Design an enzyme around this catalytic site. Sequence first.
Site, PDB file in Angstrom:
ATOM      1  N   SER A  84       0.787  -1.245   0.000  1.00 17.87           N
ATOM      2  CA  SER A  84       0.000   0.000   0.000  1.00 17.87           C
ATOM      3  C   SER A  84       0.811   1.282   0.000  1.00 17.87           C
ATOM      4  O   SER A  84       0.261   2.303  -0.379  1.00 17.87           O
ATOM      5  CB  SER A  84      -0.993   0.026   1.148  1.00 17.87           C
ATOM      6  OG  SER A  84      -1.736  -1.187   1.142  1.00 17.87           O
TER       7      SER A  84
HETATM    8  C1  LIG Z   1      -1.421  -2.257   1.779  1.00 15.77           C
HETATM    9  O1  LIG Z   1      -0.385  -2.382   2.392  1.00 15.77           O
HETATM   10  C2  LIG Z   1      -2.456  -3.332   1.861  1.00 15.77           C
HETATM   11  N1  LIG Z   1      -1.814  -4.615   2.128  1.00 15.77           N
HETATM   12  C3  LIG Z   1      -2.004  -5.696   1.358  1.00 15.77           C
HETATM   13  O2  LIG Z   1      -2.874  -5.769   0.492  1.00 15.77           O
HETATM   14  C4  LIG Z   1      -1.106  -6.851   1.676  1.00 15.77           C
HETATM   15  N2  LIG Z   1      -1.337  -7.710   2.599  1.00 15.77           N
HETATM   16  O3  LIG Z   1      -2.583  -7.461   3.259  1.00 15.77           O
HETATM   17  C5  LIG Z   1      -2.661  -8.220   4.523  1.00 15.77           C
HETATM   18  C6  LIG Z   1      -3.908  -7.615   5.144  1.00 15.77           C
HETATM   19  C7  LIG Z   1      -1.447  -7.980   5.400  1.00 15.77           C
HETATM   20  C8  LIG Z   1      -2.896  -9.740   4.287  1.00 15.77           C
HETATM   21  O4  LIG Z   1      -2.976 -10.091   3.099  1.00 15.77           O
HETATM   22  O5  LIG Z   1      -3.030 -10.500   5.267  1.00 15.77           O
HETATM   23  C9  LIG Z   1       0.107  -7.003   0.841  1.00 15.77           C
HETATM   24  C10 LIG Z   1       0.551  -6.095  -0.064  1.00 15.77           C
HETATM   25  S1  LIG Z   1       1.997  -6.645  -0.815  1.00 15.77           S
HETATM   26  C11 LIG Z   1       1.912  -8.091   0.159  1.00 15.77           C
HETATM   27  N3  LIG Z   1       2.849  -9.046   0.047  1.00 15.77           N
HETATM   28  N4  LIG Z   1       0.881  -8.148   0.972  1.00 15.77           N
HETATM   29  C12 LIG Z   1      -3.477  -3.002   2.972  1.00 15.77           C
HETATM   30  C13 LIG Z   1      -4.621  -4.012   3.069  1.00 15.77           C
HETATM   31  C14 LIG Z   1      -5.711  -3.762   2.086  1.00 15.77           C
HETATM   32  C15 LIG Z   1      -6.119  -5.002   1.353  1.00 15.77           C
HETATM   33  N5  LIG Z   1      -2.795  -2.892   4.254  1.00 15.77           N
HETATM   34  C16 LIG Z   1      -2.475  -1.665   4.657  1.00 15.77           C
HETATM   35  O6  LIG Z   1      -2.568  -0.675   3.945  1.00 15.77           O
HETATM   36  N6  LIG Z   1      -2.158  -1.578   5.995  1.00 15.77           N
HETATM   37  S2  LIG Z   1      -2.317  -0.166   6.778  1.00 15.77           S
HETATM   38  O7  LIG Z   1      -1.110  -0.014   7.523  1.00 15.77           O
HETATM   39  O8  LIG Z   1      -2.742   0.879   5.908  1.00 15.77           O
HETATM   40  N7  LIG Z   1      -3.554  -0.390   7.947  1.00 15.77           N
HETATM   41  N8  LIG Z   1      -4.765  -0.996   7.557  1.00 15.77           N
HETATM   42  C17 LIG Z   1      -5.470  -1.038   8.685  1.00 15.77           C
HETATM   43  C18 LIG Z   1      -6.810  -1.563   8.896  1.00 15.77           C
HETATM   44  C19 LIG Z   1      -7.087  -2.658   9.662  1.00 15.77           C
HETATM   45  C20 LIG Z   1      -8.444  -3.027   9.944  1.00 15.77           C
HETATM   46  O9  LIG Z   1      -8.763  -4.005  10.634  1.00 15.77           O
HETATM   47  C21 LIG Z   1      -9.498  -2.149   9.335  1.00 15.77           C
HETATM   48  O10 LIG Z   1     -10.796  -2.467   9.540  1.00 15.77           O
HETATM   49  C22 LIG Z   1      -9.138  -1.081   8.605  1.00 15.77           C
HETATM   50  N9  LIG Z   1      -7.819  -0.811   8.384  1.00 15.77           N
HETATM   51  N10 LIG Z   1      -4.769  -0.499   9.752  1.00 15.77           N
HETATM   52  C23 LIG Z   1      -5.162  -0.393  11.166  1.00 15.77           C
HETATM   53  C24 LIG Z   1      -5.907   0.891  11.485  1.00 15.77           C
HETATM   54  C25 LIG Z   1      -5.004   2.109  11.635  1.00 15.77           C
HETATM   55  S3  LIG Z   1      -5.897   3.643  11.776  1.00 15.77           S
HETATM   56  C26 LIG Z   1      -6.646   3.861  10.205  1.00 15.77           C
HETATM   57  O11 LIG Z   1      -6.930   3.476  12.764  1.00 15.77           O
HETATM   58  O12 LIG Z   1      -4.945   4.699  11.987  1.00 15.77           O
HETATM   59  C27 LIG Z   1      -3.537  -0.075   9.288  1.00 15.77           C
HETATM   60  O13 LIG Z   1      -2.662   0.435   9.952  1.00 15.77           O
END
Ligand SMILES: *C(=O)[C@@H](NC(=O)/C(=N\OC(C)(C)C(=O)O)c1csc(N)n1)[C@@H](CC=C)NC(=O)NS(=O)(=O)n1nc(C2=CC(=O)C(O)C=N2)n(CCCS(C)(=O)=O)c1=O
Length: 500
Positions: A244
Amino acid sequence: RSVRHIAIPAHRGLITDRNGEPLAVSTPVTTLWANPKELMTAKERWPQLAAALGQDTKLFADRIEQNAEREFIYLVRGLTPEQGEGVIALKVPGVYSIEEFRRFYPAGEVVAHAVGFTDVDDRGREGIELAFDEWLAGVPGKRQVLKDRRGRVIKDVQVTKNAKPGKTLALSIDLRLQYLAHRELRNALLENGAKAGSLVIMDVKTGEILAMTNQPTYNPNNRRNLQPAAMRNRAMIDVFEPGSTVKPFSMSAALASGRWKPSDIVDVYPGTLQIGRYTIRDVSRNSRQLDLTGILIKSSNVGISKIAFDIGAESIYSVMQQVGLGQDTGLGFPGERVGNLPNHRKWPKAETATLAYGYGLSVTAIQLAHAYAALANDGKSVPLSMTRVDRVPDGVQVISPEVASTVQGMLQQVVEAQGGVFRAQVPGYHAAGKSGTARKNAYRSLFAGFAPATDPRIAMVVVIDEPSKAGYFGGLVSAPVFSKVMAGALRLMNVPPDNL
Ligand SMILES: *C(=O)[C@@H](NC(=O)/C(=N\OC(C)(C)C(=O)O)c1csc(N)n1)[C@@H](CC=C)NC(=O)NS(=O)(=O)n1nc(C2=CC(=O)C(O)C=N2)n(CCCS(C)(=O)=O)c1=O
C-alpha cells in the site's frame, strides 16, 4: 648483501558525519614479526616471548622450529602500541616491529551499517569503508632495506616511495538524527517483539541520507564472533513488497492521466473484486463510494485496482520506474540490492491491479525513501547521496509539480483526516504519508512519509519486520515510530513548526 623493499601501511582517511563528528578513525597498532633464523640463536628467550603473547610455550616453540628456514614470519598483528612495547622490552634477537593501523568507530553500533568496517589488512569490507575504499585507503609506502642470507635487517638506506595518507570523507549522515533513529527503531522492535527493522531519513531537497539504521545491529569495534545476520545493512540489501505504500505513485499516474480528480468517486462495494481466478480483497469491506483520498485513507486495493484498469498499467509502471522503485540507486555499495519492478508488453488485468497496490514488486527501504523524497520535493527527484552534498546536483522533474502538490495534500489528509493514520501525526506540524502492511502468517509493517506537509524538508521510511503482537498493521506498528523520529528530526534541524 641483498637489497630488499618493505611496504609502509598508509594512514586511512578520517570518516566524519556531516558536521565533522568522527565516525571512523585510524588508530596506531603494533604488528610484530620475526626472523626465525635469528630467533634460533636465542631459544632461552622464547618461553618469555611466548608467555608475553599468551601462547603455550611448546606450541610457540613448535611454530618457530617448523619455520626455521623462512626468513620472515608474523608473530602477532594489531597489538596496542603499549602491548607491543612490552614485547620489545624483552629485547629478544630477531623480533621486529611494524606500525600498522586499525579502525576505531567512536559511535559503535549506532551507525555500524552505514559506516561499515575494515578487514584484517585495514581495507573496507562493508558500508562506506568498502564503497569509498579507494578514496579512504590512500597508497602504501616503499622503504629500501639491506638484508643478509638469514634475513637480518641491516640498515634503512632510503625511502624509494613516500606513503600517501587516505583522504577525509564527510558523510551525509547527521549523527544527532542517527542516534534518535537508532534508539526509536530499537525501542519499536522490542515493544513489538519484531525480528528486524530499518529506518531511513532523507533530505528531500539535496538527496542526502541523513540517517540509516537497522536492527539487529553490532559493535564494529568488537567483531570477535561476527554474526553475519547482525551485520546486514537491511535498508540497502533487504528487498520487500512495498504494498500500500506505492498507492500514492498509482494516484500520481491517475491524476496526470487527465481522467481523474481527487473528488472523483470509485464504488469499492462489497470490498472484493474478482478478476478471473484472482480475488482483489480489501481489509475492511464496509465501503461503497469512496473519493480518491478515501481510497488512500481506507487503503482500498479494490479502489486503486479500478483506477489502474481505467488509466492502464503503463502509466503506473512509468511513475514507479521514474521515482526509482526497483531501480539502481547509483550509490555503488557492493552487494546492494536493486529489487524488481515487473514489466509487460501487454499488461493482464491481475498484474495491473497488483502493480497498483504494490504486490509482487520488490524494493529496498532506501529506494522507497528516495521515491517519497521525489513526491515531497514537488515531484523533483534529486540523486541519492551517502556523502555530504555542498553543491546540489540538478534534479529530474519526474512527476509534475501540480500532481505532486495534489498527492502531498491527499497524504496529509491520510494522516490528519477522520479515520486516518492518526498515530503518524507529528505534534506541532502537518505531516503526510501512507502506511502499509505486507503479508510475507508473517508480516512486514510499513510507514513512508514526509514533513512539514506545507514545505517538505524530510522523507522517512520505517520498516518493522515480523511484529509479533496482536496489532501488526503498518498504521499501528510503524506510524508511531515515524511520529517520534520526525518530531525529533525536525526540531534537531530547527525546522519551524507549521501547524499554526
Ligand atoms: C497495503 O499495504 C495493503 N496490504 C495488502 O494488500 C497486503 N497484505 O494485506 C494483509 C492484510 C497484510 C494480508 O494479506 O493478510 C500485501 C501487499 S503486498 C503483500 N505481500 N501483501 C493493505 C490491506 C488492504 C487489502 N494494508 C495496509 O494498507 N495496511 S495499513 O497499515 O494501511 N492499515 N490498515 C489497517 C486496517 C485494519 C483493519 O482491521 C481495518 O478495519 C481497517 N484498516 N490499519 C489499522 C488501522 C489504523 S488507523 C486507520 O486506525 O490509523 C492499518 O494500519
